[PDB]
Amino acid sequence: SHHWGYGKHNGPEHWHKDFPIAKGERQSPVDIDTHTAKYDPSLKPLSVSYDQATNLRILNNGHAFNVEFDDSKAVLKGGPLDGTYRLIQFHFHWGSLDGQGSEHTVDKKKYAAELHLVHWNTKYGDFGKAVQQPDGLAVLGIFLKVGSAKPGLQKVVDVLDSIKTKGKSADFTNFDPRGLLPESLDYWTYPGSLTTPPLLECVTWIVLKEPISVSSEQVLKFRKLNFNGEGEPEELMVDNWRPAQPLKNRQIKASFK
């Protein structure tokens, strides 16, 4: 298949052929330069209102694994946002044993991995309408570094063996994303895009300053996933990140001095 991916023949340098907005003015990720990302006082503290979700789904879509929220609850408000944004899913980007694998960088420094909690603006009635609008999505990005285990990640890691290959999905119940947050909600924000096709410029990025620590054993489980489908040759799911994109006219703002 010539479906997009992260390989030599289908990776980020190819994406613009099917998705011309890849070369747009508000593409993500970007490098966050601490000397030019200015403190903005128009910015409020973030309001992250999460709790245990009952019915979820975990799946390997050949690009990452998603944990999807199916309850008909978890919302993000405040910070740079107007209105209420509902959590729909989260997923990660990561590197190999030999490399870093965040999407955003800070002063050109990459973190081991990056968590994306994807939220859509409830004003729009559904996700498909939301992605068509500049205020449609809010993605809360959280860096991962390797250290001690993140207890609230363990339930996710424990079920990754069951979705090893592309197309596998599984029922997943009783998960609280509060367990994925760092202590501080200090953040940077800027207007940007989905970091994967369709690369739509519909995202308010909120990137937390404080990384979470995960164990090498936890991230190892990420790296044992496969890009390929069952029965095909093994291609380990690693380095599923897009390179940093030009800031162009944008300003990155900081919630903190």
Ligand X SMILES: CC(=O)Nc1nnc(S(N)(=O)=O)s1
Q: Which residues of 27-52 are buried (b: 16+ CB within 10 A; e: fewer)?
A: bbbbbbeeeebeeeeebeebebebee
**Active-site annotation holds for 63:** yes
Of 30, 58, 81, 139, the one binding ligand X by CB under 6 A: 139
In the complex with ligand X, which residue's Cβ is closer, 63 or 253?
63
> Which residues in the 22-61 window bind ligand X by CB under 6 A?
none
User: In the structure encoding, which two tokens stand for residue 248, read together?
Assistant: 């162009």
Q: Is 218 helix (H, G, I), strand (E, B) or coil?
A: helix
β-bridge mates for residue 205, sequence order: 139, 190
Check residue 196 for interaction with ligand X (CB under 6 A).
yes
Q: Which does 194 bind (CB under 5 to 8 A by kind): Zn ion, ligand X, none?
A: ligand X
Total residues in contact with ligand X, by rule CB under 6 A: 7
> Which residues in the 58-117 window bind Zn ion by CB under 5 A?
116
Check residue 102 for interaction with ligand X (CB under 6 A).
no
In the complex with Zn ion, which residue's Cβ is closer, 66 or 255?
66
Check residue 104 for interaction with ligand X (CB under 6 A).
no
Residues at the contact surface with Zn ion, assessed by CB under 5 A: 116
Catalytic residues: 63
